[PDB]
């Protein structure tokens, strides 16, 4: 018999992104080649099958630094991290291949899906 | 020029609630009289003006235990904590006064609004 506030989930995510911008309560740095990205482990796990696996691991859960595979593109990761915190994906002709490869590695199935559909339309 | 995934914010919140149920990465216990509630500080801040103020404080941000005012009803807090993590509010005739008082203390304006409207309709 609950009632539901339609905008609540979006409002929560907006405040989680505000916390990220201000670097409040961030508990991990994701290292992608020469670049560093601060984030909240809980948000990363909530969005990515890879981070969900990493941070449920009894040893990796306590690491403050995670290094991604050297093949991962920093811009692709940046675009996906922005998506995690906003629901918005900056998908462009010049970045789609890097975004799709990063989304496959991060196990973000909905992003992979759409990248596949956008590539298929251009061929 | 971004595209947006409609269900993303709801999917994030569902996984944050799964983390709470499994007690993964919870970093605070909220003590309400004889009862204890484990939660994620980031979610509490994202939902409540009171917790936002508490956890941006340079000393309180590092506390693992927060004790609420003894006038706060544990069931009212439980209902509001469930709302924070799900967007669903278990608002009933028998709990509405406790829910509204707890929402005023926690500074959760949308919940206060609706409690006010539901009480006005019954008078």
């Amino acid at each position: 018999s609950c009632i539901q506030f339609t905008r609540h989930a979006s409002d929560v995510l907006l405040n989680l992104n505000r916390l990220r911008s201000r670097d409040i309560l961030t508990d991990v740095v994701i290292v992608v080649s020469r670049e560093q990205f601060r984030a909240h482990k809980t948000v990363l796990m909530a969005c990515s099958g890879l981070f969900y696996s990493i941070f449920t691991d009894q040893l990796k859960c306590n690491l403050s630094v995670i290094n991604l595979d050297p093949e991962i593109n920093p811009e692709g990761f940046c675009i996906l991290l922005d998506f995690m915190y906003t629901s918005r994906l900056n998908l462009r002709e010049g970045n789609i291949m890097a975004v799709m490869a990063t989304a496959m590695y991060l196990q973000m199935e909905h992003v992979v899906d759409t990248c596949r559909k956008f590539i298929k339309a251009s061929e | 020029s971004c595209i947006q995934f409609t269900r993303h914010a709801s999917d994030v919140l569902l996984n944050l609630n799964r983390l709470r149920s499994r007690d993964i990465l919870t970093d605070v216990v909220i003590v309400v009289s004889r009862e204890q509630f484990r939660a994620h500080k980031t979610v509490l801040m994202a939902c409540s003006g009171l917790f936002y103020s508490i956890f941006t404080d340079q000393l309180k941000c590092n506390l693992s235990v927060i004790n609420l005012d003894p006038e706060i009803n544990p069931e009212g807090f439980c209902i509001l904590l469930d709302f924070m993590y799900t967007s669903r509010l278990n608002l009933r005739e028998g709990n509405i006064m406790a829910v509204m008082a707890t929402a005023m203390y926690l500074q959760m304006e949308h919940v206060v609004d609706t409690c006010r409207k539901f009480i006005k309709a019954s008078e």
Binding site: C2, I3, Q4, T6 | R88, L89
Partner: peptide, 4 residues
């Protein structure tokens, strides 16, 4: 607010 809605009836979900």
């Amino acid at each position: 607010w809605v009836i979900p």
